């Protein structure tokens, strides 16, 4: 929850032991009280300008949550926070050395370093590992 | 002022291929299933309400988060007179889901209540030792 946005990547993994600062917990403690049924204690009393906007607000709260669970769901990394993969890093993506990425770098600058290359990494996890391991697992159950 | 050919795969690109060639392709049909004057909003809920159902049925079967998985439910040869290597090397999926369309309801009941319901009462009572 953005408390370490000026910290470094080699140090922000220390405070990330809290559940991304209880990231998703702020949603459930919100939608317990977003679903205060005073909206149902009125039926909004009409259709109003705000309730049009709240309806377009809750949808984005639904969709953009799902696009982050699905991508974690497909990567063999459902529900975890720090998982490793089988994909080898290609040095053509970034010729930065080891410590400069971790000890000597922010996060948002590192986004603009590989925002070009990000989409290639997405395919190169699924079709390289999570499509792939499931067949090789199923072969190991053939016996 | 752009343009290069295909690299990995396309959307629905394996839908004329065999099963053994489409089984390595499932992620592209898995990603774009969700993302893509009120009548846009009525679409933006049906696209959600279809996604949860397919997500939910994988959840009940002990098979959530995996793309593929196996069970212990036995295949019944009454359902298919097709030989084995004809299925994995000759038949496409679009043809295949016209052939087992009728049996589908029998299948889904015979996954949950057959096994993954039964693999919890057996599972919970492997304690006490």
């Amino acid at each position, epitope marked *: 929850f953005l408390g370490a946005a000026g910290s470094t990547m080699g140090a922000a993994s220390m405070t990330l032991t809290v559940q991304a600062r209880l990231l998703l917990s702020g949603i459930v403690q919100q939608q317990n009280n977003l679903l205060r049924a005073i909206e149902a204690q009125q039926h909004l009393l009409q259709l109003t300008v705000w309730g049009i906007k709240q309806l377009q607000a809750r949808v984005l709260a639904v969709e953009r949550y799902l696009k982050d669970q699905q991508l974690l769901g497909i990567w063999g990394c459902s529900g975890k926070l720090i998982c490793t993969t089988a994909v080898p890093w290609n040095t053509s993506w970034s010729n930065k050395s080891y410590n400069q990425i971790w000890n000597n770098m922010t996060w948002m600058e590192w986004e603009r370093e590989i925002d070009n290359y990000t*989409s290639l990494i997405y*395919t190169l996890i699924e079709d390289s590992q999570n499509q792939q391991e499931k067949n090789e697992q199923e072969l190991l159950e053939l016996d | *002022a*752009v343009g*290069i050919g295909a*690299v*990995f*795969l396309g959307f629905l690109g394996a839908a004329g291929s065999t099963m053994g060639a489409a089984s390595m392709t499932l992620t*592209v049909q898995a990603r*774009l299933l969700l993302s893509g004057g009120i009548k846009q909003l009525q679409a933006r809920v049906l696209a959600v309400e279809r996604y949860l159902k397919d997500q939910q049925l994988l959840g009940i079967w002990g098979c959530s988060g995996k793309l593929i998985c196996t069970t212990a439910v036995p295949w019944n040869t009454s359902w298919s007179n097709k030989s084995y290597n004809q299925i994995w090397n000759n038949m496409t999926w679009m043809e295949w889901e016209r052939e087992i369309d009728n049996y589908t309801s029998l299948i889904y009941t015979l996954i949950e209540d057959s096994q993954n319901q039964q693999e919890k009462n057996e599972q919970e009572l492997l304690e006490l030792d």
Partner: antibody, heavy 134, light 109 residues
Framework: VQLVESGGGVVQPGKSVRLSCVVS????????MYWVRQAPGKGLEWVAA????????VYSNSVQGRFLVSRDNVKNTLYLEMNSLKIEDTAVYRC????????????????????????????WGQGTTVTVSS | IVMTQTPLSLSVTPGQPASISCKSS???????????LYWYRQKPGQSPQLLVF???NRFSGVSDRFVGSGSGTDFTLRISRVEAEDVGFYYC?????????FGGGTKVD
């Protein structure tokens, strides 16, 4: 920066030479290049183009299949090899850099196909000249 | 695609404004949000130099009196108070797709 060529001159029909454009200071693997052909007393004709990673090559239709281009990002060179020469190929060749920077290839999600962006030119080399005659 | 221009010869003297337009067959608007038409100038006996890259922006070492505009098909480069060293040619160059062509080059004396 500095941008010239080499290997120019005059040859016969049916022959084959290769020029050599050399850049000076900018990071050469970052940028794509081009080739242009100004005929004497005429306008300009586009010839060729290479990607920054030397993977994408687009030729003109008239000189299709005959010529050859390549890169060497370490040696910062730029080659235009040519084959099956004709007399109407006698003109001024110029080595030229893209104006903007280019990125890496894009890979649209919906179809597994990359995309190399291509935009026009700012730095024309003064260029050699090849004449095809008897 | 095809893209020619007009007029070929404008033999003038300094002190007056004028304009050179390049006419487009295929309309130009790429999906990035911009129209890839590049206007630039050679001198006689010289490799050319960039006047303006886009029809909006300019380049370094360019006088302020060099203005350009146009629709997706109409395209116009206007030179206010045409300067004494405006000799040579003026090529209109597009960058839609391949093969990317040119104009003939309007001679200005």
């Amino acid at each position: 920066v500095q941008l010239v060529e080499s290997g120019g001159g005059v040859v016969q029909p049916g022959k084959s030479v290769r020029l050599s454009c050399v850049v000076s200071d900018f990071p050469f693997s970052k940028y794509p290049m081009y080739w242009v052909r100004q005929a004497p007393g005429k306008g300009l004709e586009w010839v060729a183009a290479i990607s920054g990673d030397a993977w994408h090559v687009v030729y003109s239709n008239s000189v299709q299949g005959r010529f050859l281009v390549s890169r060497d990002n370490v040696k910062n060179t730029l080659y235009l090899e040519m084959n099956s020469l004709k007399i109407e190929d006698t003109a001024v060749y110029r080595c030229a850099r893209m104006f903007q920077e280019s990125g890496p290839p894009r890979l649209d999600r919906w179809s597994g196909r990359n995309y190399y962006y291509y935009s026009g030119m700012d730095v024309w080399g003064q260029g050699t000249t090849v004449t095809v005659s008897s | 695609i095809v893209m020619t221009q007009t007029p070929l010869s404008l033999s003038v003297t300094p002190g007056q404004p004028a304009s050179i337009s390049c006419k487009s067959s295929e309309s130009l608007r790429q999906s990035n949000g911009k129209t890839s038409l590049y206007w630039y100038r050679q001198k006689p006996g010289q490799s050319p130099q960039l006047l303006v890259f886009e029809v909006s922006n300019r380049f370094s070492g360019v006088s302020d009196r060099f203005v350009g505009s146009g629709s997706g098909t109409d395209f116009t480069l206007r030179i206010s108070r045409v300067e004494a060293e405006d000799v040579g040619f003026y090529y209109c160059m597009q960058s839609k797709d391949f093969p990317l062509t040119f104009g003939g080059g309007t001679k200005v004396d």
